[PDB]
Amino acid sequence: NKENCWKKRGLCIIPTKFGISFTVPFLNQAGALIHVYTDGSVLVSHGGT
Amino acid sequence: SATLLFQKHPPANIQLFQEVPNGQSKEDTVGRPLPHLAAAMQASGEAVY
Amino acid sequence: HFYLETHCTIAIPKGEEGEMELFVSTQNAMKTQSFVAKMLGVPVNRILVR
């Protein structure tokens, strides 16, 4: 910055925290459905995309 | 520096993460950097949207 | 048997991981699913019969 009149540098360090959950209480639920077929292969299904 | 044409500095990327415990089963992939299961089909144009 | 609707299958390949979805006139979705999977050489979990 001392050595450049028409270009400047900047530097900054910032923290963050972020709360984990739906803020609507009832949304915090999840289901899954699992089948094992007779060859032993497994098909998993769950509510997420 | 005002007279200088834009110049690319070369990239440097470092990723640091934790190894899984030494004797964890090879079949237990939790904690391992397993690629997205569909990435190969995405790269091939086979993944269906 | 002379069921009025004769045998019929529609098979839809999905193009991914050997998956296939079939619409079938069958009393036996399970063996349909597993015989299709055996012929194709893929896990039964790839095959959906409806």
Q: Which chains touch A (3 or more CB pairs under 8 A)?
A: B, C
- Asked if B41 and C17 come within 8 Å (Cβ–Cβ), the reply is yes
Phi then psi for C23, rounded to 5 degrees?
-115, 120
Tokens 């237990």, residue? Answer: B28
Angle at C21 between CA C18 and CA C24, to 5 degrees: 135
Q: What subunits make at least 3 CB pairs under 8 angstroms with B? A: A, C
Residue type, B16: L
Residues of C near B (Cβ–Cβ under 8 Å) read 14-17
Consult the annotation and say whether A23 binds a ligand: yes
Using a CB–CB cutoff of 8 Å, tell me whether B39 touches chain C.
no
> What DSSP line would sit under chain A, residue for residue?
-TT-SS--------------S-SSGGG----EEEEE-TTS-EEEEES--
User: Maximum CA pair distance of chain A?
Assistant: 74
* B26 Cα to chain C: minimum distance (Å): 22
SS (H, E, C) B1-48: CCCCCCCCCCCCCCCCCCCCCCCCCCCCCCCCCCCCCCHHHHHHCCCC
CA distance B3 to chain A (A): 10
Q: Which residues pair with C12 in a beta bridge?
A: C21
Pairwise CB contact (< 8 Å): C17 & B47: no
